[PDB]
Every structure is written in C-alpha cells, then in structure tokens.
Amino acid sequence: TDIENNVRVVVYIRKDVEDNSQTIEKEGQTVTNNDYHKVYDSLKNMSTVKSVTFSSKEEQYEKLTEIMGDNWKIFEGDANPLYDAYIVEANAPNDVKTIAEDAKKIEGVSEVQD
C-alpha cells in the first residue's frame, strides 16, 4: 500500500461521520452503521481510481508520534485532533486534480489534499 506522491490523493473525513465502522452504538446495543463505506463507495467507483485505503486518526496519531515528537504534551491526551482519511491512488497523475475536486463533493468529506 505504498503509493507514489504524484498519484496520491488524501481524502480527510468529517470528524462526525464514521465511514469505516460497520457497527455503531444505539440504545446500548451494537447495531449496523447506515453510513458505512459511503465515501469509500463513491471513491472506489471512480474509473481513474486504483485503490482506496482507510487510515484511521488513531493510526496517524501513533505515526505522528513516531515522526519526531514526544514532548508534544500540549497536544496529546487532550483529545486526538487528527482526521480519518482515505489514501486514494490515481491511475495517472493527470487524474489527481480530476479526482480531488470530486472527492470534496462527497458528503462526509471534510478536506482533500491533492
């Protein structure tokens, strides 16, 4: 799942939408997540897309800590501020901007790094 810069789009997900969880909590029971894979589906349907990989904010938070920083006290423990993302690979770099604009239309998307 290593992608070359020139065909990578990062689609960050709204903090209020849980695209990767099949289940959620309702009335104390674990029940089905309606919104599951909506953003994933839209992205994976694009004909110029080759793969769409989930990167959970908790994953990037440990990876962020791995990349220098431990005394980041003033940020950590205080409610992880990172975003769930889809790392998307384009078939050609020519598509990247044609893909990023579309991604930013799909409801549930917060931002998109081209």
Author numbering: 52 to 165
What text appears in the publication on this structure?
FtsEX comprises a cell division-regulating integral membrane protein (FtsX) and a cytoplasmic ATPase (FtsE) that resembles an ATP-binding cassette (ABC) transporter. Hydrolysis causes a conformational change that is transmitted through the membrane via FtsX, an integral membrane protein with two extracellular loops (ECLs), denoted the large (ECL1) and small (ECL2) loops. The folded structure (residues 57 to 166) reveals a central core composed of a four-stranded antiparallel β-sheet (β1, β6, β4, and β5) and two helices (α1 and α3), an α-helical lobe (residues 107 to 135) harboring the α2 helix, and an extended β-hairpin (β2 and β3). The helical lobe mediates a physical interaction with the peptidoglycan hydrolase PcsB via the coiled-coil domain of PcsB (PscBCC).
Three different structures, with resolutions ranging from 2.0 to 2.3 Å, were solved by X-ray crystallography, each in the presence of a different detergent. The detergents used were dodecyltrimethylammonium chloride (detergent 1 [D1]), n-undecyl-β-d-maltoside (detergent 2 [D2]), and n-decyl-β-d-maltoside (detergent 3 [D3]). In all cases, two independent protein molecules are present in the asymmetric unit, arranged in such a way as to keep hydrophobic residues from their α-helical lobes buried. Different conformations were observed for the β-hairpin and the helical lobe among the six structures, depending on the presence and identity of the detergent molecule bound to FtsXECL1. In any case, the crystal structures suggest that changes in the protein backbone and side chains of the helical lobe occur when a detergent ligand is bound. These changes create a cavity in which the detergent molecules insert, with a large part of the helical lobe (from Q111 to E127) affected by the interaction with detergent. Residues Y112, W123, E127, and F126 are strongly perturbed upon detergent ligand binding, with the hydroxyl moiety of Y112 interacting with carboxylate of E127. Changes in W123 and F126 stabilize the hydrophobic region of detergent 1. A similar interaction pattern is observed for detergents 2 and 3; additional interactions are observed in N131 with detergents 2 and 3, which are characterized by a larger hydrophilic head (maltose). Full stabilization of the hydrophobic tail of the detergents is completed by the same hydrophobic residues (W123 and F126) but from a symmetry-related molecule.
